[PDB]
Each structure stands twice: as structure tokens, then as C-alpha cells.
Symmetry: D2
Subunit: 494 residues, 4 copies
């Protein structure tokens, strides 16, 4: 049950957010953001640059000063505030789902039922962590009392992508604020709007000024400013593998700030011959096509055992051909447009590359509409490991199906990747499942499911898919600094 | 490693009461005989501790626990060193202790050596590593305060251990209590005090301060009951029959509100799905029931077998029980030794006669295996029904119950229809069946495609009437730890 | 600020709460509850007994059945429910605060600012714990995958005292529900009203029927029925130590149910000569007299170093004499009546006992008013360790001041007690504080403060003051069962 | 209680350690290691370069392969091996302490009682962690079973310094091997000998070949090759802040490997007017001069309250003048030589800068012997914040004493540093101790003591002092990779 969408949501916030106030760029420059369904400009947005980031970092640093409201505040109260934000986001849930859909392209039903639900669950989960992340009292040798405090890292720079604007914002803000940090956040030029509105609610919820600061703008400018800043303590970045290198380089050439990265992937989805066919087919479709295919953990390498290959493919093509593409605000729409023109063209490039290399086109393969960046759900069969489409992140509605024989074989082929973000195993066999989840070199391994995310369970990549983890108790460690205090005592006893 | 040839008649060097690192006679000067179950002959006399010797033990322990004492001041890391030393000393005397364990208890020497001793060693060494790693917390309390917790020793811990695993039970008790800075007054089984008393000697040699560990051999209703009722015992831990754990607890509740943990009986279900690996399932089910002469609280004493494989399984099961070699525990061919004593001997025989009378199908064995010693034939009952006494009551002997079932919903309900809940097992190749069953079974430990798999790392304990609280793992430390909160006014609290 | 109270609040809930339903006793019996300030009957309340307990237990068992809504419910959602309950409670904060004062006698200002706030903070704390109490994956020897599940204990009997009716309810429900248990709760016959109103809010919050059942009645009847019930998996009791020994006895001869107890105390409050005099004096007054002296952790043995003893006693007597006793609804009132005639009489007896013992009566010592159960703030000086008033829990506004010379001396004297619930030290010296915080045999040691409770920090007794802990992560341990699952795997790797 | 030293220990191991075998450098080149007490060459050592690092890494990768002896080994057994290694090191304790002194210069008595003891305690501490670092079972939403495996990070590059050759090696090997990692370790060109002997003991203990590989050589060559390697999964560096940057840059332009740094410091040692004079003076001397002043956490900024400043400075100078410099093998020697000519000249240069900037040279300040790199214990008084010697890590026997007035003042000046490795407070006051321990921006705060290390308490810096922690349970985090496994189940229940 979903409330009727306002298909033309008004935009209220489009400037830079610092100290709970709205600011034009120092330069007074602005940039257009576009509706990827129509190609029409939604509105102009403040274009943040190095000098704007400087203002934002200075505001955060002051907010973080010892004895400030934010620093003195009860941990439990940081929790109440996160809970209040959740309630405000829920109050304006219909509006935000619509705004997300307008700015990003994903179906309003998914924005509402998935993205918005997950945002509420993430903030609410982390609200609970604010006063429960304990330090230790330590049985150290000698006549001493030793213990640790789990202190905030400090000023945290956070750069989030366009594929899940609201959710990614929440994945970052939850652990950061629960642990008492202050934030300087750069949002994607493609999808700045929803985050800017949330900043208004952050103000409304009662967060002290300077605790959260959002600077819309371009990456080569605003993003690198954060990563290179001499007073930023930590930088978390979710984006492509390409941009990620550009960040850790800039971040290491400054003040030795802490760095975490959530990057691309080429995740294998393995279908053993004893898997439930109907289930494995629907899940493989879901695994790849979700969010217009725009997921780092997309199941973009579908390994199918030879004995069931033909039937699996047969059933998969029918499912991809029945996938409804169109107006994101139509309840019946399964697939919206790609986020922008640059993505649109790049996806079409990979499709054409697939054909040249001898992959077998089974459906789609071309443009799905003359208006907006709609691409047809595309499926490639008989893919081989050495193909570009088998190796590179496409980030589009393009599915690759490979055939294997043995379980030992597929382990080697699934693991032969510079990526290692996620993987899946579909089988009914207890031993096969335990064998594969242990042997697969990925941060998350799903068994008989896919894209199962909980605020409670960590997500992150092995290898070149990134470092560190988000979500769960683990997501706190990156936003925490350990101080050991060791006190001479008259006589230590047990 | 290879099993060294055993001295089949090892000498006894310790048979008295151990208090403050010294050997005592009982006050009454009374001693009692401990028997060799393989021959029925007396091994030696053992000082017979009673309440008055327990009072000496508790006084001793209390003194060693005093603020400023060597034990209380000792670095936690050092308590770990002490535990490793003890382990090193036991490994030195492993051949001797393994043989002594066989002499006093009856279990095959090869098993004492390769199983019991290895597990004792692994248990002590594991907890040696916990000594300096069980942290309290610092806590982000509201207001201008600094709040933290100290995990302090619970104090004077009375520990009563059974006879089925004398060395191992000792280790399971000493490991966590010593790692966390406690002192102990231990009462060992009258059937098997010898090995525990020799280890008391090793505890001295290892360097533990006097009074940290005190051992009082004696009888249950006297020595054991005195620990449970003592006004200066802070914790009592009892492993044994469900029947006696009831008594022990009843005593603790009427004394000083001491902390109590129990490790009691069971009638654990071993569930064989039709898709199980047959040969594997057959050998594991045999092991699951017959191990240690069937003398395990977690014995797989209700063998549920899916109807399609029932006949084959029962046939293979009876073949294996028929081939199981019973005899002298020092002969390497022996898989089964005598039961622990005559009382058990007869109780098991009684249960067998009950099973026959109540209409269970006697498939093999069924009576005495030798004229001398407490040897019983490995016994298998087929067509066992839930309502039968032998399907309900713990037998603690080499008596196997095999029950037929049809569906997975059926077996879960039947397995869970028990006052016990110590352990359970599931043999199947299907992921969903394993997961469905491991979640649904009301048992403290669930084994999947294996049985009797223990590790110092993984907690062990029962649901329902099989006791309360756990042993082993990090959880074993909780029952031996006391939490103190210290909350301090500070000038200005900041994150 | 504090809103004006309705001094004659209406009563809505006075029956037995089972399956979200209000029931009369099977016997149709009711009992009168009395207003301690006036000695007048407030209303009649259903008198539950063994048959009513038996119905409650059955309902709880049924709600706890595998596949039930409460068992299948996401842990995070149990969290939502506790937060909703807290919200409904805060909604009715002004009303519940007045009802608490009417039935119990404590000053309304304190019911509102202390009791009700701590109730809210408690439930909101545990809401956070619902989906964060993880089991473990364990590196066991051999080719095995071993892990633990932290399952609920099941049907939990909870018996709560009359001194903090609402807060003790929360201390019990928070952890039990966060961990997925079901509850059969016996409330005190002196103060059943506020707890019954909360049950109404538990139904309104959306808790499934049977998850919380509340049976008002008497101890020898309803209480013993819970403790002795064959189908109750755990019993938690807070109250006098004598009655605690009975509850622990009932559980032993039934079904080996897990029992935790929170019992009495005779907590030492240690004042070193280097302490802040003004703070120490006001804190020692607070520590003994708070809640009409009706706290098990009351600082009922005030040890004062001999060099500041004369001055401390002077200030302490003056403070006691100025303490305003009267209508708990008058904002000027610091001290209401004792909870009932039985307590009233007990306190009078203890006062006389001290007098006959040769303790010096420095002020008070009699009845403070005609109506209700009011007792004059009373102070004894030159108290000795062997005195009955120095050893037994008085649970009234009766202060015991003792003189000591050295720190090594006061440690011994402080510890020479069969109780061990709490302790405090007042000093400015770092080493003195550490020495004493380590040496005192108490579950809680306060330094330069007293009665500082936080939802995050555990509370419970050493020795005969009880077993187990409430509050904090520790509060969850008693409400969880550990299950180990150990699985054979093909080949264990790190 | 110290065994007599062999003042000329024989060298048995001087090559590259790969696969438990001793290797010459590919180029066959070698370099001299010097005795800093005599300036004379002890012996030549294999000069490993990029090609050799390449061999070692391949060796490590092979030992880490799924199904290998190290990967299949019981975790408890990894612990048994660490204990065996510790026992072997204890067997050869006299020899190792003598060789440490010979190569490094530290007093033999210190090498024996401090260094080797701490080495033993570190290896034994972590041996105990081997089978106790659990993953989690997670109460995720939905019908799933979700859990984490704590897997090894893989091939770990470890570059260690020359100030604590043996202890540093153990600080790295302990956590790394306890978690099942494999290691390529680069030892200091100045002190490579003891570490290579320890590798012979690693072979003796029974560690599978390729689990530990040691490549002696130079920083710009061997050290850089490790950091830039495309098959190294993690890099841990300890040394100057300068080189730490080089490492973090090289380690970012390669394969996004994990990086932890332990860098320099300029740690504030704060003496309040109510401190114990005798104790504070001896401890401030220890804090600075320990190990020829060669400790990153040295108390190289001694702040003294003006009321006690004069007396503290007088006592400190007297103690510095009394410090015995000489042959490290002489039981009376308190201070040996600096590590090498480079450091020798660098410290004398800092001394020169100190005099040129107008800090009061109170004692020492020159060369202490005609042979070897001995420098007199030096004390500067009236040091100001803006002086080079008050800002830069000197890493030698050069003490700075500063005057302050208020606790608010000293807090601001102590934190006014790009370094935050450690700090200390000497006071008898409870409140002052707590205010400072919280306010000081350092990774370790000592109260009424200094340089108190325990295997159990974590160590590491804030800001430019590095990232991450060593020792304790936290020391395990940088060596662990988290895999989340999420499994579809029939019907989830609590
Ligand atoms: O709808 C779901 N995932 C969609 C999804 C895919 C990729 C994502 C994501 C959500 O969040 C970030 O990346 C989903 C499902 Cl089927 C089961 C459990 C929990 C969740 Cl959240
Ligand atoms: O008001 C307080 N305590 C009063 C109090 C006394 C005894 C109690 C209690 C509260 O809760 C149960 O027992 C109080 C104080 Cl002075 C400081 C910090 C936090 C709190 Cl909650
Ligand atoms: O000798 C000690 N520190 C000397 C020391 C200084 C700097 C260090 C170190 C040891 O290890 C690495 O850095 C020391 C002390 Cl006084 C007390 C407790 C534990 C320790 Cl280990
Ligand atoms: Na857009
Ligand atoms: Na015997
Ligand atoms: Na009342
Ligand atoms: Na050298």
C-alpha cells in the first residue's frame, strides 16, 4: 500500500548548508540538476568549491570544540536526536520518495517501499548505538588501573554517490552522529536535492549548528577539497574505483587522515544444478537489474551449471523481456531511466562491446525510449571470462550469463577478479553452501538470496572493491578513536 | 601421536585431603575405599572428608582471597602463566594420569590418553589465554560522570564434579574459575578421586598460592551438601544427576543466596534424516550412545530414524554393537570397559529389563558381559515408543533406543517433548532441513552431521531440566565473574 | 518545568491484564488500595490469585510458541514497540506522575522529574538493544563451523516492589522484551495502579496479546504462584531480603527456573576529611532521605572522618530539621508519607530500637502529622557498628552517623556487613578514591556523588543484597539462553 | 638478577629469510651493520631489494592459499606455535639481549629485563588470542540467518624501526600470526640482526614455510617495494612521520591495500603544582631519557606549574648530570650510544638549534665520548612553544622544560601540536586528573606514571602520530577481514 505520488514535487532547498543556515556559493555560481526521465532541468543548485568546503570545515571544527553543546551532550541524547530525524523523515516520507524519484529516476514505489524504509531503519538502528558502544577496563600488569575511551574521530568528510542518494546519506550520517562526530558532506551533482531537504529536517530535529554540513558541487573541485583538507580527520568515499584512487592519493598527501572506500564490483552469482529453478531465476534477475542495474554489488556475473544452463537462460530471457520500463511514477514501472547522459552512453558502449567480442545477445540491446535515458533490459549468454563485459563494471541493465561444470572450477573463476564486493550461491546442499561461502573472496556472500541488507549486518568489499565496512556494530569502528588512560594505583587487586 | 604402553597397575601417591598446598587426614581420621571397576577389587583408601574438613577448606580459600593476598595481587597475565605451567606438568605425566584414570574409572586407556588427557590440556591452555582478556567496560552514562565496570572474581567457589570424566570435569571447573581470579573448594566423586588428587600435587608444583585450590574427597550427602549450604561459599557449581542437582539447589537457597549453576541429565535425540550419509550416520550414532560406556549426560539416547532407512539403519546398528569389543580397558582392542560401579551396573541392568517388559524389541546384548567387573553387553532396542520408560529416563549405560519417524515436523515435536534439553543432533545433506532443525530443537547444543564435538571455545549447557548456565567458551567466565560499577562525578563530561 | 498536577486523578485500570484483556479475578474478589497521605481508600483492584496466575502463564506460553507473531517478529521491530510504549508514556507523563504520587506518596515534582524521566530513559535504552545482542561464530578445533544463538529464556515471572512502581516495571520490561521474552508480572498491592495503566499503553503500542500479562494481588498468593509455577522459565524479584529468600526457595522445589534477586542493603557513605563539606553534607542528606528513605541502596551508614565529624553532624542535623514534610502535591514538600501503615509501624519500631540502644537522638524521632503515614526526619549520632540500627535495613527517614579515624579502618567497617548493594566515598584525593572504589565490597561505588543511576550502567548487589544485574548490556544476560550449533564442514580454513 | 652478558655475541643469521630458507640478495650485494658503541662494523647483511621482496611476497601468497597447512591449522594451534616461539626466545634470552645491545646500543640490563621480557609477554598474550577472536551472529530483519567470519587480511607487509628491534617485531608478529595472516617483514638496516635470529627460531618453532618472510635492506628500496606491491593486502609502518607519508602515498597508488602507521610524537608531560615532587622528577626523567631518548612517545615537552617550576628544574638538572653514560654492557651504564652516525649528527644539530633559539642550556649539550655515538644528557629550560625544539621530534637525550600557570592554559598548549601519540599528568587531585585525561588529545594518557605499556592496553596516535592501534584486543582489528554471510531460512524465529 503506497500513497499516490506528487509527480511534480516542489523544491525547497537548493543552497549550501552550514551552521544550520543556507548559503550561496562564495562565487554565487549555481549548476542545473536534471530529471533523467524527461531530461528537463528541475532547478539550479549552489555550486560549492574549495572556499565553501573551507567554511563548512571551520563550522564543523567549532561544533566539535571541547565543551560545545554537541560534545557535552549525553550520548543517549544524540540517540534521541537521530530518532527525531527518523520521525521527521517519516513524516515527509511521501514527499521525499517523490523527490528522490524525480531527481534520480528510480520507480516511486521502490523509493517509497525500499529506499525510504531502509533510511528509516538505518537511522533508527544507529540511534540505538549512541550510548552502547563501550570502551574497556583492562587487566594490565602492574599496580595500574587501565581503560579505554571510544572517542569521536572528529571532523568527518563524506562523499556519497547518486545511485542511492537518501540511503547512502543515511549510511554515513548514522554511525558518524551516533558516535558524536561532526560532518562535512558532499552530495552528487546528479542528485543533490533530497539530501539538501534532509539537512532542513536535521535543523528541525534540533542538531546543534555545524554538526552536519552539506556542500553541493562537482567532484574535481568540492570532493577533492574535502579529501585534501588539512583539518579533515577522516574521509569516507563511495563511488567508482577510478575516483577512489584520486581520493586516497589526495588524502595521503595532506594530513594522514583516516580513509575508507566503498568501490565498484563484478559480483558473481552462482547457480548450482540443485538450486530451486523458479527462485534462482527471479533472484538472478533481481540481483542484476535492481535500481536500473546501478548497484556496485550487482550480480553482474551469472554462473550457471551446464546441466541447467539452457532452461535457466530460457526462463531468464522471458523475465527480462517482461520487465516494464518507463515512467518512474507509473505504479507498473519496474525500470526507470539511467541517472544521466554520461551513464546512458557508457552503458550502450558496453553493450556494443559485448556484441563485438562474440557474446550472444538474447534480448534488448538498445534504446528503450526516444525521451529520457531509458535502456532496454539486455541479456548476454555464453559469456567468457576474458570478455570486457565479463570483467568491467557496467552499472546498467545488462546481464551476463556464463556456464560452468564443477564447483572447484567456478570458485576459481568467481575469485579471479580484482573485485570482491559481493557474491551469491544458490543450492540446496548444506556442504556445497558452506564450501562456497568460505571459499568465495567477497565481503558479503548471500546463500539462496541476493541484495539482502540489514542495518545490523556489515557491508563492504574485499580486494579493489574498497576497504572497511558499513552497517552493523562494525560501522562504528571507522568513526571511533581509541584513547588508553593508564593510572598509577596504590595496590592493584583482582 | 603414538600411544605409549601403559603401566596397567600404576601406583597411588595422593589419597588425602588437600588444603593450603598440604595433605591432611579427615578430622574423623576416617577413610573410604575406591574400587577398580574392571575387577571389583579395592585400589586404596581415601580420606573421607566431611563438613568439618569443608570448613577447613572454606576458611583456607577465604584467606587466600583476602585483599592484598598473593593471589589477589597477582597479575592476571601471571594466573595465565600458572595455568600453562599446570598444563605443562599434566602433559609431562600424561601417560601416568591416563592409566590412573583407566584404573579408577574403567574407560579404555587409549581413550583416556588420546581423548581425556588431550581435552584437559586443551581446556587449561585455552583458559590460560582468557586470564588477562576478560575486560570490564567504560560506559557513556548520562550527565557529568565517568562510569565503568570491574569484572571481579565471584569469590569462594564450591565445585562438585562427577565420575564419568574425572580429569576433564576438573579442568572444565578449574579453568574458568582460576582464569578469573577465584578460589575453589572442590569435592570429587567417591568413585574416582585418584586422578584429581594427583593433579592437586601438580597444582602445588605449578606454583599456585596455598588455599587457591582446596580438594575434599568424601561422600555426596555430607561433604557435597556442606559446600552447598556453607555460609561463606559465594558460588556452587554442580555437575551430575538431575535428581541431586535438585537437592544441591534446595540447599543453596536456604543458606546465603550463593550463585548456583547446574549441569544435569539428558535424553538427547539423534535425528537421522532419510538423506543422511548412511555409513557416517551409523558410526556417529554408535559413538553418540556408546562412548564412555554410555556414561555421558549428552548421550544420543533417543535415535530417531526416518522410516525409509529405518530397517537398514537398525541392521547396520545392531551389527556394529555386536562387534563392539568389551573387556580389559588396558587391552588396545577394547572399545568398552566396565561401568563405574555396582550401583550403576544394577541400575542399567534394571532399565534393560524394563525395556524388555514394556515391549521394546531387544535386538542384541541385554545382560552381563563378564562374571567379574561391571561389564555389560552393548544393548540395542528397536521399535522404541515415546511412552516407554527407556525412552524417557536417562540410563547412563550402553543401551541404545531406536525410534522410527516419518516427517520433519513430527521428529522436532517428539524430540522436544522431553523434560531434558542438553543436546541434540541432525544428520542430513539438505541446508534448509539443517537450518529448520537447528533453530527448532530445544537443546543447548545441536550437532549437525556429527556428535559429541566439544571444544574449549564453544559453550556447553542444557535447556529445561538438563541444568542452567554454560561451561567452556567466553560464556564460562560469566558465572565466575562479579560486576562492580564505579560512577565518578567529573567536572565536565565530553564525548 | 513541572505542570500543575491533578491532585485527584481518575482511575481507569483496576483489573487483571491478560492477552491485552481486562479480567476480574476468577473469584471476583477485589482489594482496596490506600492513599498514604490521607489514609483513605483510592479504589478497589482485582485480587489475582493462583488461578489467575495460571491463566496469565498459559497466555504467555502461547504467545511464545514458535511461529507466533512475537517469535517471528524482527528484533528491530521489538525495538519499535518499546519506543512506541515510551512515547505513549511520555504522552501521559503528567497523569502518571500524579497517579504515582497518589498511590505511593512520593512528592509529585519527583515523580515527574525523576521517576517518569527514568522510565522513559530506561525503555528507550532497551529499545536500542533489541537487535544488537549478537551471538558468536567460534574458531573451534577441527573441520567444523560452530556458532551460538542468543535465544529468549521464555516465560519470565516478574515481581516488583512498591517504592518505585513505574520505574521497577520499566527496569523489568525493558530487557525482557528487548530480548523477545514474554512476561507475567506481579505488581505490589500497595501500588498497583500506575502499572495497570501502563498495561493499557502496552496494548495501545501494538504488543501482541500475551506478551505482557499483569496480575495485581498479594505476595503469599499471586507472587508465590509465579515463583512456584511449573511453566515459568525465569523469575525476577525485587524486594526485602526475607521475602527474597522465600521466592528463591519456591523456584528450587519446582522446575529449576533461573532466579535473579534484588534485595536490601545497609550502604556505607564514606566522608573523608578532604571532602567538599557543603557537597558532602547535601549529598549525605539526599543519600539517606530520598524517596522517604525507601530505597534499598540508601546511604544508611554515614561514616565521617573524626576531624570533620562535629561540623558534618551540625550541618546534617540542621538540614534534617529544615526538610519539609507534607502534602506530596505541594511543590514545597520535600518528603511525603511512608507507603503504608505496616512500614509506618516498622519505622517507628526501629526509631525506638535505636533509642533503647543508646544511640544519640539528634532530631526528629516521632510522627510528623495526624493523617497519613508521616514520620519526622530523624538523625542518630555516635552510632556503633554493633547497633541494630547500624546493621538492619530501616527503609525510612532515619539517618545513622558514625565516626572513624583511618581509611584502612573504615574499609573494614564498611565491609563488615552481610549486605553489599552500594557504597560511596567523598574525597578530593585521587589515590583515596581508587583505593576505596577497589576495596569496598559493593555492587556500585559512587565517588563524590550518590544515587546516580543511568540506563547504560548496571546495578545489583554483592552478598545478601541479591544476585544478577539490571540496567546496561548486563541486564540482558539474565533474559537470554545460549544455544551452540556445531556443523561438520568439508574443509575448515581460516 | 641479570645473567652476565656475552659482550661479543656471535652472529649466525645475516641473510634474507624466505620459505624458512636463508637467501642471498639476487644482486648478491650486502651492507654493513655497525656497533654504535664502537663505530665498528659487526658484519655484512644481505641487501634485499625489489626482486627479493617479490620472492618473499610470492612465498607468502603461496602459504596463504586455501587448503594450505597454515590456512587449515586449528586456531588454537596457531596459539601453541606462538607459545613455542616465546619459549625458544626465553631459552636464548641472554644471547638475544646481548645481540640487541651490540647492534642497537641500549644498555644490556635494559635489553634483558625490559625488551626481552616485553617480547615474551607480547607473544604469550597474543598466543592466547588465537582462538578467541569471534565473529558475530546477527539478528537481521527477515527470514535469514546472518553471521560474520573474521578472516585474515592476507599478505601483510610489516616495516619495523631500530629503536626496539625485537619488541617491534613481536608487536607485529603477535597479532598478525594469531589471526592467521602471513608476513613479509622489512627490518631496520641499523638493527637487522636479532630479528633474523628470531626467524631461525620461527623455523625451529614449526611455522609453515612462507608464513614469515624477512627481507633485510634499505628503506627507499625494500621498504618501498613492500608498500607498492600489487599482491600485498595490508601494510603496517612504524617510523618517522616523514617516511610515513611516503608509505601512505606509495600504498595508495598501488592496490588500495590497508595501511596503518605508527609515527613520531612530541608528547606533553604535565606536572601540576600538587604533584609528588620526588616521583614526578624521576618519572619526567624516565619519560624523556628512556632508551637514549629514542621513543616516539618520549615526554619531550615537560610542562611544570610555575609554583614548583624552579624546584623541578633544579632537581631535573641534578638528575640529568647524575645519569651515567658509557659501555652498555656495564651494569652501571644508564645510557648507551645513539643508534648511528645519522642520528648522532641529527641530535647534535637539534641541540645547536636549541641554543640558537634561546632556550636555556642547563646541562650537557655535547658529545659524551671520543668513541661511538654518545651524547650527554641535555636539559633545556625556559622553552617556549614556538621554538623548534618544542615542536619537532628530536629522538635523543634532550629534555625541554616549559612553564605554565593555569590548567586551562596548559590544556591548550599541550594539544597545540600536529602530534598526538601520548601525554601524561602528575597530580594528587581526582578532578584535575579526570579533566586532563579527557581533554588531552593523545592516544595514551598516563596518570602519575609514564611509559607504562601492557600487552593488554592498546597503543597508537591521534593526528599525525599515525593511525590505528597496536596491542590489546584492538591490535587484532587491523589484521582481520570481515565476511558477512546471509542465508535464506524457512522461517526466522527469535
Ligand atoms: O529490497 C532489498 N534490497 C534491495 C537493495 C539492493 C541493493 C542495495 C540496497 C537495497 O541498499 C543498497 O544497495 C532487500 C531484500 Cl530483497 C531483502 C532484505 C532486505 C532488503 Cl533491503
Ligand atoms: O535523581 C537521581 N537519583 C535519585 C534516585 C535515588 C534512588 C533510586 C533512583 C533514583 O532510581 C531507583 O533508585 C539522580 C541523580 Cl541525583 C544524579 C544522576 C542521575 C539520577 Cl537518576
Ligand atoms: O619499563 C617500562 N617502560 C619502558 C618503555 C618505554 C618506552 C617503550 C617501551 C617500554 O616499550 C615500547 O616503548 C614499563 C613500566 Cl615503567 C611500567 C610498566 C610496564 C612497562 Cl613496559
Ligand atoms: Na537529477
Ligand atoms: Na574407582
Ligand atoms: Na497505595
Ligand atoms: Na647496528
Amino acid at each position: 500500500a503506497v500513497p499516490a505520488p506528487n509527480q511534480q514535487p516542489e523544491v525547497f532547498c537548493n543552497q549550501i548548508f552550514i551552521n544550520n543556515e543556507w548559503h550561496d556559493a562564495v562565487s554565487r555560481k549555481t549548476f542545473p540538476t536534471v530529471n533523467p526521465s524527461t531530461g528537463e532541468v528541475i532547478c539550479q543548485v549552489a555550486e560549492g568549491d574549495k572556499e565553501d568546503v573551507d567554511k563548512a570545515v571551520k563550522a564543523a571544527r567549532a561544533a566539535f570544540q571541547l565543551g560545545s553543546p554537541w560534545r557535552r551532550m549525553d550520548a543517549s541524547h544524540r540517540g534521541r536526536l537521530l530518532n527525531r530525524l527518523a520521525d521527521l523523515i517519516e513524516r515527509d516520507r511521501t514527499y521525499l520518495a517523490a523527490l528522490e524519484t524525480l531527481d534520480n529516476g528510480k520507480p516511486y514505489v521502490i523509493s517509497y517501499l525500499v529506499d525510504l524504509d531502509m533510511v528509516l531503519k538505518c537511522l533508527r538502528y544507529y540511534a540505538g548505538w549512541a550510548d552502547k558502544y563501550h570502551g574497556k577496563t583492562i587487566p594490565i600488569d602492574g599496580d595500574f588501573f587501565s581503560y579505554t575511551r571510544h572517542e569521536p574521530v572528529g571532523v568527518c568528510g563524506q562523499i556519497i554517490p547518486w545511485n542511492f542518494p537518501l540511503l547512502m546519506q543515511a549510511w554515513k550520517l548514522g554511525p558518524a552522529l551516533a558516535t558524536g562526530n561532526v560532518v562535512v558532506m558532499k552530495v552528487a551533482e546528479q542528485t543533490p536535492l533530497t539530501a539538501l531537504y534532509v539537512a532542513n529536517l536535521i535543523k528541525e530535529a534540533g542538531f546543534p549548528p555545524g554538526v552536519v554540513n552539506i556542500v553541493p558541487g562537482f567532484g574535481p573541485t568540492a570532493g577533492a577539497a574535502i579529501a585534501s583538507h588539512e583539518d579533515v580527520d577522516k574521509v569516507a568515499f563511495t563511488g567508482s574505483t577510478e575516483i577512489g584512487r584520486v581520493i586516497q592519493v589526495a588524502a595521503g598527501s595532506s594530513n594522514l587522515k583516516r580513509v575508507t572506500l566503498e568501490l565498484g564490483g563484478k559480483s558473481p552469482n552462482i547457480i548450482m544444478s540443485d538450486a530451486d529453478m523458479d527462485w534462482a531465476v527471479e533472484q538472478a534477475h533481481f540481483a542484476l537489474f535492481f535500481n536500473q542495474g546501478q548497484c556496485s554489488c550487482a550480480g553482474s556475473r551469472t554462473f550457471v551449471q551446464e546441466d541447467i544452463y539452457d532452461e535457466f537462460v530460457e526462463r531468464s530471457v522471458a523475465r527480462a523481456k517482461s520487465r516494464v520500463v518507463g515512467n518512474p511514477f507509473d505504479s507498473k514501472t519496474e525500470q526507470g531511466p539511467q541517472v544521466d547522459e554520461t551513464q546512458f552512453k557508457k552503458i550502450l558502449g558496453y553493450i556494443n562491446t559485448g556484441k563485438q567480442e562474440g557474446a550472444k545477445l538474447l534480448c534488448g540491446g538498445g534504446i528503450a525510449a526516444d525521451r529520457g535515458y531509458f535502456i532496454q533490459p539486455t541479456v548476454f549468454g555464453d559469456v567468457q571470462d576474458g570478455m570486457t563485459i565479463a570483467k568491467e563494471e557496467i552499472f546498467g541493465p545488462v546481464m551476463q550469463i556464463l556456464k560452468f561444470k564443477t564447483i572447484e572450477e567456478v570458485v576459481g573463476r568467481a575469485n579471479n577478479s580484482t573485485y570482491g564486493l559481493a557474491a551469491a550461491v544458490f543450492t540446496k546442499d548444506l556442504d556445497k553452501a558452506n564450501y562456497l561461502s568460505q571459499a568465495l573472496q567477497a565481503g558479503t556472500v548471500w546463500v539462496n538470496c541476493y541484495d539482502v541488507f540489514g542495518a545490523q549486518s556489515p557491508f563492504g568489499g574485499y580486494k579493489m572493491s574498497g576497504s572497511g565496512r558499513e552497517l552493523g556494530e562494525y560501522g562504528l569502528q571507522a568513526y571511533t578513536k581509541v584513547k588508553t588512560v593508564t593510572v598509577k594505583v596504590p595496590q592493584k587487586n583482582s
